[PDB]
Amino acid sequence: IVGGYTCGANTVPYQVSLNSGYHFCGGSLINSQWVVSAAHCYKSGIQVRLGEDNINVVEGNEQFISASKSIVHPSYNSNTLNNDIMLIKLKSAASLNSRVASISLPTSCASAGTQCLISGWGNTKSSGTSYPDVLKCLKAPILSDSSCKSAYPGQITSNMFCAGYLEGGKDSCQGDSGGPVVCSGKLQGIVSWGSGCAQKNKPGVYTKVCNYVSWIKQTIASN
Ligand SMILES: [Ca+2]
């Protein structure tokens, strides 16, 4: 997250870190057994880390649970990033509490202008590199589909939306991928892609979760 703030420990209780020896992507806890992330984050050998603030220090509220299964969306295209969503099942159920909590799925799509919370452990610099230990947060609005398409000609599908600031300076970034965009208490987006980070006229692009609720629910119900 570039241009954001320190969230505070366990203030974003649905945020998870995906770990394969090292943090590599975010995700969102949607029930005791299942995490939502980006398909481009797929790899084997995932350990889900819940209850994290500093990802390099054991602070006392963590739950580390290995994934048993991951399910990339059936129509994910890694070239275009269309349908950049995947589900990860935990080998054992998380113990839900005030600091480890699921986030609700939306019932309707969000609108441009809605303010959302974007979070992660990704790069905090737009020109260099600096990776934080503690969770960072950014409040940002959803942008109009016409502004989004104009920013990224030929690249924005109906399964994507833009959020952020056209002036630059405030965005998600590498290492935030897979993490949440939460608006009014609902998971509306997944950190997906962008041109660099925090660049003028190049807002963040997010997977549009509302399009996937029926796939998420039916997949969980049979897996
Ligand atoms: Ca920790």
Domain extents for the chain?
Answer: 1-12+103-210, 13-102+211-222
The answer to whether 83 and 76 are in contact (CB under 8 A) is: yes
Strands 34-37 and 86-90: antiparallel
**Any alpha helices (H) in the chain, and if so which ranges?**
145-151, 213-221
59 a known binding residue? no
Residue 202 Cα to chain centre, angstroms: 18
Q: What is the DSSP-derived secondary structure letter of residue 105?
A: P
Q: What is the DSSP-derived secondary structure letter of residue 202?
A: B
Please give the distance, rounded to the nearest whole angstrom, from the Cα atom of residue 162 to the centre of ligand 1: 31
For 153, residues 6+ apart whose C-beta sits below 8 A from its C-beta are: none
For 128, residues 6+ apart whose C-beta sits below 8 A from its C-beta are: none
Amino acid identity, position 187: L
Catalytically active residues, by annotation: 40, 84, 177
Angle at 16 between CA 72 and CA 51, to 5 degrees: 150
Sheet holding 136-141, edge to edge: 5-6, 136-141, 115-120, 180-183, 186-193, 204-208, 160-163
Residue 143 Cα to chain centre, angstroms: 17
**Any alpha helices (H) in 77-188, and if so which ranges?**
145-151
Q: Which fold has domain 13-102+211-222?
A: Thrombin, subunit H (2.40.10)
Alpha-carbon distance of 95 to 93, in angstroms, equals 6
The answer to whether 51 and 135 are in contact (CB under 8 A) is: no
Alpha-carbon distance of 74 to 77, in angstroms, equals 9
Positions of E strands within 79-159: 86-90, 115-120, 136-141
51 a known binding residue? no
Angle at 13 between CA 132 and CA 2, to 5 degrees: 30
Run of H or E including 191: strand 186-193
* Entry resolution (Å): 0.8
Q: What is the CA radius of gyration of the chain?
A: 16
**Do 1-12+103-210 and 13-102+211-222 have matching folds?**
yes
52 a known binding residue? yes
Please give the distance, rounded to the nearest whole angstrom, from the Cα atom of residue 55 to the centre of ligand 1: 4
Burial label for 145, CB within 10 Å (0-12, 13-18, 19+), is middle
The answer to whether 122 and 171 are in contact (CB under 8 A) is: no
Preceding-residue numbers of gaps in the chain (C–N over 2.5 Å): none
Alpha-carbon distance of 89 to 79, in angstroms, equals 25
54 a known binding residue? yes
For 54, residues 6+ apart whose C-beta sits below 8 A from its C-beta are: 9, 133, 134
CATH architecture of 1-12+103-210: Beta Barrel (2.40)
Positions of E strands within 20-114: 23-29, 34-37, 47-50, 63-72, 86-90
Q: Calculate the alpha carbon distances from 126 to 76, 130, 139, 202 in Å.
A: 28, 9, 17, 12
Please give the distance, rounded to the nearest whole angstrom, from the Cα atom of residue 209 to the centre of ligand 1: 28
Please give the distance, rounded to the nearest whole angstrom, from the Cα atom of residue 60 to the centre of ligand 1: 7
Please give the distance, rounded to the nearest whole angstrom, from the Cα atom of residue 56 to the centre of ligand 1: 6
120 a known binding residue? no
